Amino acid sequence: SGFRKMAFPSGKVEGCMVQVTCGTTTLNGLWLDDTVYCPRHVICTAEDMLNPNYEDLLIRKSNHSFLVQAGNVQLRVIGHSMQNCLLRLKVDTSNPKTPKYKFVRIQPGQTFSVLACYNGSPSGVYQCAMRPNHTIKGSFLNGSCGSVGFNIDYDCVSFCYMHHMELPTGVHAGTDLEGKFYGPFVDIQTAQAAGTDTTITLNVLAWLYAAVINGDRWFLNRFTTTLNDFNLVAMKYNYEPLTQDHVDILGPLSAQTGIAVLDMCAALKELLQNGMNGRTILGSTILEDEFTPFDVVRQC
């Protein structure tokens, strides 16, 4: 029993973390085979950060402009190029700790584990979700650039996020491992807004199933709704509309618990309409939207 925010084991990602220095900036790099990935803004001076021209900035640099350290072992940079908002630094040594991996673009609603690093060194791990507005509500400090987000499928590490920056509202923006930002964001030190965020309905319901599997049952009722009537109420409280596809995903959980998806939706409607009245679901008064149906199944 018990239900916790759970990150994947981070060992395989730890042996990929290195330190990357250009000028007076030190941040984190991801070392896979003979390539080191890091945010490209590592080449910027304070004044550059304001209105950078990255192509211009990168041609004015060389292989010796970059210092890469794995532990205290110095890695020799023998090549460099731009990969959208990331630099690909080619090194003369292949990472012997390279796991089976792939690069994935994570979808809004989906989750991943963040390995927050400072000075090339793993500092902490936590579970995170890609918001519908394409930001992440992370916990990051200066120097955390290059920290990555990942999932594990069997043996394979799927890298999906690399950290770049924090927006004025305190939320975070970054890229996939091809250097394309999630969302409307650009790597410039200028005020940027995200779109209005919505609640990941599919995850909320998944977390409701997790509560039932774990003995919390107070919020259940015999009321029932149609998908359409649920969505009518959902959007009014800033929830994502739920689709038949989403209903089909909750199938296995619905079967394990004996609770129809539409019945759980009616439970959610009442919670939305009437609140909780001091009571808690899995020790929380906030309706949790950062566990996917998969995260629930995997943990339960």
């Binding site: 803004h41 910027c44 950060m49 975070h172 410039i188």
Partner: peptide, 4 residues
């Protein structure tokens, strides 16, 4: 906007 702060670069980390």
């Amino acid at each position: 906007t702060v670069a980390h």
